[PDB]
Copies of this chain bind each other. A is one copy, B any other.
């Protein structure tokens, strides 16, 4: 009745650590009944490492909590693949990233931001890189009582905002802001540990003489930003200047040097000179320019918006029994974004074709089994499936 096919398939990235570990559930379907092997995505199946990686039974692969010295990347940092084979052929579950992590002494800091009296400011905390993948700001705090809770950009008209990305965006800064500390507070997506920051940053108001001019730090002059659909985000324009600058957001028209001012609304709001947006629609992608200006000078910052969607792969049809030397209607239905390239293969073996519809005009005996599209990309991947019954 059935060739193979995936019911319980492993959501791509899967992370964990010593002091908790993990194990990975892949079970397949068919009506002989698909034998789940676990392999590296490089063809070869996985063995058994005493004290860490070990082939369980009940549709999974267990990574024991491990002595912090039993970490070895060959095990704890690899791409695995549920192999799903029967007598009609085999299929490979999409890239599943094992990432065991040694819990280690982390802590975020809150620096001083140095500001020209009257300008706005954006404080990040910082979260060292190694944990940065699983430690994210969830609060801010005054030395004077106040809390600044994250949001999906609910309110807009006000001195304080926590950006979608967890920085605290002060709309303007009087000197009356230099007596008061701020600490940030991440939380661990794995352990669950809420913890404050080793230090707390003070605001340094610097009163200006006469005038100054707007300019920007190199790592603020060229920004790249990725967000997912229907989620909220913000575009930044980090400039200072006395007197205070005017920020002008324009979107470019695709593949031109002509541009088009960013219209503001209930969806698109600017707390100058930052853009803050909800419902991250897919047209939103593209390139943006922020143009900042005062009586003394000007400046600008390009920014590249890449809104992303949940991509997919499915063939058309999932089962085609042919006739001995026929066509091959092997299209694949879709939605999602971005695709960095779709792939093809048959029975655990990569073939070579890399386009929408697969077709081998003259069928064969060794030309039947399971064929799968692979809609990859840089930070993810989805998969499809098709079997070739015969006449």
Q: A206–B199 Cα gap in the complex (Å)? A: 15
Q: How does the 8 Å CB contact mask read for A186-211 relative to B, with 1 for contact and 0 for none?
A: 00000000000001000010100110
Which A204-250 residues have C-beta < 8 A from chain B?
204, 206, 209-210, 212-213, 217-219
Q: What B residues does A204 contact at CB under 8 A?
A: 114, 204, 206
Q: A156–B284 Cα gap in the complex (Å)? A: 56
Q: Is A112 an interface residue (CB 8 A)?
A: yes
Q: A218–B219 Cα gap in the complex (Å)? A: 7
Q: What B residues does A213 contact at CB under 8 A?
A: 109
The chain B residue sitting closest to A215, CB to CB, is B126
For this chain, the copies found in one complex come to: 2
Count of chain A residues with Cβ under 8 Å from any Cβ of B? 13
Q: What B residues does A212 contact at CB under 8 A?
A: 199
Instruction: Determine how close the nearest CB of chain B comes to the CB of A167; give it in whole angstroms.
Output: 17
Q: A206–B114 Cα gap in the complex (Å)? A: 10
Q: A219–B218 Cα gap in the complex (Å)? A: 7
Q: What B residues does A112 contact at CB under 8 A?
A: 206
Instruction: Determine how close the nearest CB of chain B comes to the CB of A51; give it in whole angstroms.
Output: 31
Q: A109–B213 Cα gap in the complex (Å)? A: 10
Q: How does the 8 Å CB contact mask read for A98-121 relative to B, with 1 for contact and 0 for none?
A: 000000000001001010000000
Instruction: Determine how close the nearest CB of chain B comes to the CB of A34; give it in whole angstroms.
Output: 47
The chain B residue sitting closest to A114, CB to CB, is B114
Return 14 A-B CB contacts under 8 Å, by A number: A109-B213, A112-B206, A114-B114, A114-B204, A199-B209, A199-B210, A199-B212, A204-B204, A204-B206, A217-B217, A217-B219, A218-B218, A218-B219, A219-B219
Q: Besides A109-B213, A114-B204, A199-B210, 11 other CB < 8 A contacts?
A: A112-B206, A114-B114, A199-B209, A199-B212, A204-B204, A204-B206, A217-B217, A217-B219, A218-B218, A218-B219, A219-B219
Going nearest first, the 8 A-B pairs with the smallest beta carbon separation are A218-B219, A114-B114, A112-B206, A204-B206, A218-B218, A199-B209, A199-B212, A219-B219
